[PDB]
Design an enzyme around this catalytic site. Structure first.
Site, PDB file in Angstrom:
ATOM      1  N   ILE A  35      48.331 -22.343  54.828  1.00 50.04           N
ATOM      2  CA  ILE A  35      48.195 -21.384  55.916  1.00 50.04           C
ATOM      3  C   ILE A  35      48.126 -19.948  55.425  1.00 50.04           C
ATOM      4  O   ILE A  35      48.081 -19.029  56.243  1.00 50.04           O
ATOM      5  CB  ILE A  35      49.331 -21.538  56.948  1.00 50.04           C
ATOM      6  N   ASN A  37      47.137 -17.351  51.592  1.00 49.70           N
ATOM      7  CA  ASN A  37      46.894 -17.160  50.171  1.00 49.70           C
ATOM      8  C   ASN A  37      47.255 -15.731  49.780  1.00 49.70           C
ATOM      9  O   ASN A  37      47.558 -14.889  50.630  1.00 49.70           O
ATOM     10  CB  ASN A  37      45.428 -17.458  49.824  1.00 49.70           C
ATOM     11  N   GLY A  38      47.227 -15.463  48.480  1.00 47.74           N
ATOM     12  CA  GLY A  38      47.484 -14.128  47.977  1.00 47.74           C
ATOM     13  C   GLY A  38      47.985 -14.163  46.547  1.00 47.74           C
ATOM     14  O   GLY A  38      48.092 -15.221  45.923  1.00 47.74           O
ATOM     15  N   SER A  39      48.291 -12.961  46.038  1.00 45.30           N
ATOM     16  CA  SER A  39      48.838 -12.797  44.691  1.00 45.30           C
ATOM     17  C   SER A  39      50.286 -13.252  44.592  1.00 45.30           C
ATOM     18  O   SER A  39      50.697 -13.770  43.549  1.00 45.30           O
ATOM     19  CB  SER A  39      48.731 -11.338  44.251  1.00 45.30           C
ATOM     20  N   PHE A  40      51.064 -13.073  45.664  1.00 43.75           N
ATOM     21  CA  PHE A  40      52.429 -13.588  45.707  1.00 43.75           C
ATOM     22  C   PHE A  40      52.469 -15.088  45.454  1.00 43.75           C
ATOM     23  O   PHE A  40      53.420 -15.592  44.845  1.00 43.75           O
ATOM     24  CB  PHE A  40      53.054 -13.287  47.068  1.00 43.75           C
ATOM     25  N   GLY A  41      51.457 -15.811  45.924  1.00 42.26           N
ATOM     26  CA  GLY A  41      51.447 -17.256  45.881  1.00 42.26           C
ATOM     27  C   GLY A  41      50.787 -17.843  47.112  1.00 42.26           C
ATOM     28  O   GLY A  41      49.806 -17.292  47.620  1.00 42.26           O
ATOM     29  N   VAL A  43      51.477 -19.976  51.011  1.00 40.16           N
ATOM     30  CA  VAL A  43      52.353 -20.413  52.093  1.00 40.16           C
ATOM     31  C   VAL A  43      51.743 -21.663  52.712  1.00 40.16           C
ATOM     32  O   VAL A  43      50.579 -21.651  53.129  1.00 40.16           O
ATOM     33  CB  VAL A  43      52.551 -19.313  53.147  1.00 40.16           C
ATOM     34  N   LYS A  58      56.994 -21.174  51.452  1.00 40.33           N
ATOM     35  CA  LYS A  58      56.439 -20.094  50.645  1.00 40.33           C
ATOM     36  C   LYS A  58      56.691 -20.406  49.175  1.00 40.33           C
ATOM     37  O   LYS A  58      57.846 -20.515  48.748  1.00 40.33           O
ATOM     38  CB  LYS A  58      57.063 -18.757  51.038  1.00 40.33           C
ATOM     39  N   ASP A 152      58.621  -3.225  53.946  1.00 43.14           N
ATOM     40  CA  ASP A 152      57.255  -3.741  54.247  1.00 43.14           C
ATOM     41  C   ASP A 152      57.199  -4.091  55.728  1.00 43.14           C
ATOM     42  O   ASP A 152      56.760  -5.199  56.054  1.00 43.14           O
ATOM     43  CB  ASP A 152      56.854  -4.932  53.376  1.00 43.14           C
TER      44      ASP A 152
HETATM   45  O1  LIG Z   1      57.109 -14.438  53.609  1.00 43.16           O
HETATM   46  C1  LIG Z   1      57.951 -14.844  54.449  1.00 43.16           C
HETATM   47  O2  LIG Z   1      59.162 -14.621  54.475  1.00 43.16           O
HETATM   48  C2  LIG Z   1      57.376 -15.711  55.554  1.00 43.16           C
HETATM   49  C3  LIG Z   1      58.193 -16.477  56.393  1.00 43.16           C
HETATM   50  C4  LIG Z   1      57.649 -17.253  57.381  1.00 43.16           C
HETATM   51  C5  LIG Z   1      56.255 -17.276  57.548  1.00 43.16           C
HETATM   52  C6  LIG Z   1      55.456 -16.509  56.702  1.00 43.16           C
HETATM   53  C7  LIG Z   1      56.009 -15.711  55.688  1.00 43.16           C
HETATM   54  N1  LIG Z   1      54.056 -16.444  56.764  1.00 43.16           N
HETATM   55  C8  LIG Z   1      53.496 -17.192  57.717  1.00 43.16           C
HETATM   56  N2  LIG Z   1      52.108 -17.188  57.849  1.00 43.16           N
HETATM   57  C9  LIG Z   1      51.135 -16.590  57.065  1.00 43.16           C
HETATM   58  C10 LIG Z   1      49.967 -16.211  57.737  1.00 43.16           C
HETATM   59  C11 LIG Z   1      48.931 -15.612  57.064  1.00 43.16           C
HETATM   60  C12 LIG Z   1      49.034 -15.378  55.698  1.00 43.16           C
HETATM   61  C13 LIG Z   1      50.193 -15.763  55.054  1.00 43.16           C
HETATM   62 CL1  LIG Z   1      50.292 -15.461  53.369  1.00 43.16          CL
HETATM   63  C14 LIG Z   1      51.265 -16.370  55.679  1.00 43.16           C
HETATM   64  C15 LIG Z   1      54.222 -18.016  58.639  1.00 43.16           C
HETATM   65  C16 LIG Z   1      53.560 -18.781  59.624  1.00 43.16           C
HETATM   66  C17 LIG Z   1      54.332 -19.546  60.466  1.00 43.16           C
HETATM   67  N3  LIG Z   1      55.696 -19.603  60.400  1.00 43.16           N
HETATM   68  C18 LIG Z   1      56.299 -18.874  59.465  1.00 43.16           C
HETATM   69  C19 LIG Z   1      55.601 -18.057  58.552  1.00 43.16           C
HETATM   70  Y   LIG Z   2      54.467  -8.340  50.894  1.00 42.81           Y
END
Ligand SMILES: O=C(O)c1ccc2c(c1)nc(Nc1cccc(Cl)c1)c1ccncc12
Ligand SMILES: [Y+3]
Ligand SMILES: [Y+3]
Length: 357
Positions: A35, A37-41, A43, A58, A152
């Site tokens: 769901i 992508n990116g440089s962090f890794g 998800v 993540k 952030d």
């Molecule tokens: O980083 C966290 O703490 C963190 C924690 C929870 C979510 C997240 C990032 N990123 C989500 N989605 C997402 C959507 C678009 C791009 C990226 Cl890289 C991630 C996401 C979706 C649904 N439920 C929880 C999360």
């Molecule tokens: Y960030």
């Protein structure tokens, strides 16, 4: 570590639970899809086999203590995404280890909900702005009580359940505990929401950088677009001068004392009532004026923001979400949240819900 096949593909991992005792447990998840992508890794999304609940995993690389894990493990708040479990796996790079963080799954974000209204050239109803902002400030008041600065704060990091109207702050990867003496990097926040003292190169900044970022999200929800859309680091400051005017020599000293005061082209402060669309709620403008401020110490605290008159509707006993449902939890305050500004407890918790101690 162990990919089985009962439904079709079940991954079973001994994942340590985040909040609570270090009692490593075996956790099964399925429906694993990417769901993000990116440089962090990366998800992933997944469904736990035991509970059927949805989770987000993540996956990041680690070497030899990880700050994000140590912070996610300590925090427990209704308006913060919860670290259900964490575990170490392998993957995209052989010889390397990967930290996996299992977290609450939230279906939508404030960014996507606001982009919907923006595309239709419509403005988000203020009851949504009040709810999302109030919850963001509670999550900020909680993490700041531990000295943790998020660093952030952006609409893309405001997870949202559009049915329950519950907001979860997420992405604590750039977060850090701020101690009085130690310096901190200045190029940190997302540019659209970067504080001016960060542009002025201040390394002694405080948690006020988060409150600034929040004010940028309040204005963005009231305007329909980012208030300070900077092309780059230098434009970002230009964008702030278009609204806030030129900073005063005193203000430049409060932002970065080490900075050599110079005589800047003195631009006038564009009145706040004119920056926002006509019939924008005056209390919404009054709060934004108290958050988007050059002097970091003059910005409101997250609890002071919650107590602002803009949020008085949320304290009405007859308040209900527009979908019929009642409002999410708004007054389940913990002593730690109210630790700073204790007397606000009787102001933040309305009479109709004083059972919250
Ligand atoms: O980083 C966290 O703490 C963190 C924690 C929870 C979510 C997240 C990032 N990123 C989500 N989605 C997402 C959507 C678009 C791009 C990226 Cl890289 C991630 C996401 C979706 C649904 N439920 C929880 C999360
Ligand atoms: Y960030
Ligand atoms: Y520009």
């Amino acid at each position: 570590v162990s990919r089985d096949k009962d439904g079709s593909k079940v991954t079973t991992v001994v994942a340590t639970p985040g909040q609570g005792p270090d009692r490593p447990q075996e956790v099964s998840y399925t429906d694993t899809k990417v769901i993000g992508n990116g440089s962090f890794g990366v998800v992933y999304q997944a469904k736990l086999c035991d509970s059927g609940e949805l989770v987000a995993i993540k996956k990041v690389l680690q070497d030899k203590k990880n700050r994000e894990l140590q912070i996610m493990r300590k925090l427990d708040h209704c308006n913060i995404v919860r670290l259900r479990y964490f575990f170490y796996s392998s993957g995209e790079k052989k010889d390397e280890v990967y930290l996996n963080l299992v977290l609450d799954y939230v279906p939508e974000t404030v960014y996507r909900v606001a982009r919907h209204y923006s595309r239709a050239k419509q403005t988000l109803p203020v009851i949504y702005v009040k709810l999302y902002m109030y919850q963001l400030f509670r999550s900020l008041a909680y993490i700041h009580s531990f000295g943790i600065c998020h660093r952030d704060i952006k609409p893309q990091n405001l997870l949202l359940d559009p049915d329950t109207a519950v907001l979860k702050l997420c992405d604590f990867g750039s977060a850090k505990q701020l101690v009085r003496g130690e310096p901190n990097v200045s190029y940190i926040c997302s540019r659209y929401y970067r504080a001016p003292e960060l542009i002025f190169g201040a390394t002694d900044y405080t948690s006020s950088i988060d409150v600034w970022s929040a004010g940028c999200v309040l204005a963005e929800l009231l305007l329909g677009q980012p208030i300070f859309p900077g092309d780059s680091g230098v434009d970002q400051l230009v964008e702030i001068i278009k609204v806030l005017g030129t900073p005063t020599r005193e203000q430049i000293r409060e932002m970065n004392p080490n900075y050599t005061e110079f005589k800047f082209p003195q631009i006038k402060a564009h009145p706040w009532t004119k920056v926002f669309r006509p019939r924008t709620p005056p209390e919404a403008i009054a709060l934004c004026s108290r958050l988007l401020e050059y002097t970091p110490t003059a910005r409101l605290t997250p609890l002071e923001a919650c107590a602002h008159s803009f949020f008085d509707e949320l304290r009405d006993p007859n308040v209900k979400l527009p979908n019929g449902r009642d409002t999410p939890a708004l007054f389940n305050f913990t002593t730690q949240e109210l630790s700073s500004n204790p007397p606000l407890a009787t102001i933040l918790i309305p009479p109709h819900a004083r059972e919250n101690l």
